[PDB]
């Protein structure tokens, strides 16, 4: 009669196996839907890095430009400065000249005032000598 | 009516061995993605350090450029002050030349006008003693 005596053992065999499978798909469906989230986190983080690298790339340019800007205003301040230290030396020069020129004009003006008295002394001498010659000349000859 | 030779177990048993190794495959693809996720987390960090450095470096340069630019303004007005002083003094120097010459020309014509008096004076004297000719 067998065709039922062990159709019980068939359906029971299918029972045990089947819900082994059940369990396994439960793992399948889950593992791969969970992974799918972790794998979309990678696809977001790869683009995040992609921007951030065309960002860091701009920041480096922006900063190399800002350093060149600084190196140029600062070479420009080496030059104005050396040109100011020249102007300074040309004003000191030209003003240590004045200072010698004014000590020159000082001694010469002392000579001029001094020679101005001399004409005033002799003018006193002569007037007296012209008087006492008209005197000693009236007391006698003509 | 043969209990379809209960091999219909293989319909769900072959897909049991399959669905079982597949799963252990996703265990692998799980790990690989984990590692590539850590790696990636690190370079994103190194990218933040380098993005900031690039912002500092640039902020540094912008500050220094302003400090410099202000010093220019100052050395420059000071250069114009040094020039104007070099120029006023140059003109002073020049007035003094003219005046040292205007003074020397008078100091000479007046050196003569003194030797001239001294001749007048010389003869009046050589004559005061000349009219003294007579002492008792």
Swiss-Prot record, chain A:
Tree of life domain: Eukaryota
Region (Disordered): 24-44
Modified residue annotations for Phosphoserine: 82, 94, 114
Annotated localization: Cytoplasm, Cytoskeleton
Role, per record: Binds to actin filaments in muscle and non-muscle cells. Plays a central role, in association with the troponin complex, in the calcium dependent regulation of vertebrate striated muscle contraction. Smooth muscle contraction is regulated by interaction with caldesmon. In non-muscle cells is implicated in stabilizing cytoskeleton actin filaments.
Record's comment describing the protein's domains: The molecule is in a coiled coil structure that is formed by 2 polypeptide chains. The sequence exhibits a prominent seven-residues periodicity.
Subunit composition and interactions: Homodimer. Heterodimer of an alpha (TPM1, TPM3 or TPM4) and a beta (TPM2) chain. Interacts with HRG (via the HRR domain); the interaction contributes to the antiangiogenic properties of the histidine/proline-rich region (HRR) of HRG. Interacts (via N-terminus) with LMOD2 (via N-terminus) and TMOD1 (via N-terminus).
Recorded family membership: Belongs to the tropomyosin family.
Name of the featured protein: Tropomyosin alpha-1 chain
UniProt source species: Rattus norvegicus
Full protein: residues contained: 93 to 208 of 284
From Swiss-Prot, chain B:
Main localization, broad class: cytoplasm
Highest rank taxon of the organism: Eukaryota
Region (Disordered): 19-39
Location(s), subcellular: Cytoplasm, Cytoskeleton
Keywords per UniProt: Acetylation, Actin-binding, Coiled coil, Cytoplasm, Cytoskeleton, Muscle protein, Phosphoprotein
UniProt modified residues of type Phosphoserine: 77, 89, 109
Record-level GO cellular component terms: actin cytoskeleton; actin filament; bleb; cytoplasm; myofibril; protein-containing complex; ruffle membrane; stress fiber
Record-level Gene Ontology MF annotations: actin binding; actin filament binding; cytoskeletal protein binding; disordered domain specific binding; identical protein binding; protein heterodimerization activity; protein homodimerization activity
BP GO annotations: actin filament capping; actin filament organization; cardiac muscle contraction; cellular response to reactive oxygen species; in utero embryonic development; muscle contraction; muscle filament sliding; negative regulation of cell migration
Family statement drawn from the similarity comment of this UniProt entry: Belongs to the tropomyosin family.
Domain notes from UniProt: The molecule is in a coiled coil structure that is formed by 2 polypeptide chains. The sequence exhibits a prominent seven-residues periodicity.
General function of this protein: Binds to actin filaments in muscle and non-muscle cells. Plays a central role, in association with the troponin complex, in the calcium dependent regulation of vertebrate striated muscle contraction. Smooth muscle contraction is regulated by interaction with caldesmon. In non-muscle cells is implicated in stabilizing cytoskeleton actin filaments.
Subunit (UniProt): Homodimer. Heterodimer of an alpha (TPM1, TPM3 or TPM4) and a beta (TPM2) chain. Interacts with HRG (via the HRR domain); the interaction contributes to the antiangiogenic properties of the histidine/proline-rich region (HRR) of HRG. Interacts (via N-terminus) with LMOD2 (via N-terminus) and TMOD1 (via N-terminus).
Name of this protein: Tropomyosin alpha-1 chain
Organism: Rattus norvegicus
Shown part of the complete sequence: 98 to 208 of 284
């Amino acid at each position: 009669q067998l065709v039922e005596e062990e159709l019980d053992r068939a359906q029971e065999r299918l029972a045990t196996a089947l819900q082994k499978l059940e369990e396994a798909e439960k793992a399948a469906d889950e593992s791969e839907r969970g992974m799918k989230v972790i794998e979309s986190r990678a696809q977001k983080d790869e683009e995040k890095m992609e921007i951030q690298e065309i960002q860091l790339k701009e920041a480096k340019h922006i900063a190399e430009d800002a350093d060149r800007k600084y190196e140029e205003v600062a070479r420009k301040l080496v030059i104005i400065e050396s040109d100011l230290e020249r102007a300074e030396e040309r004003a000191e020069l030209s003003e240590g000249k004045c200072a010698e020129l004014e000590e020159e004009l000082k001694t010469v003006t002392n000579n001029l005032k001094s020679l101005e008295d001399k004409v005033e002394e002799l003018l006193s001498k002569n007037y007296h000598l012209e008087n006492e010659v008209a005197r000693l000349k009236k007391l006698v000859g003509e």
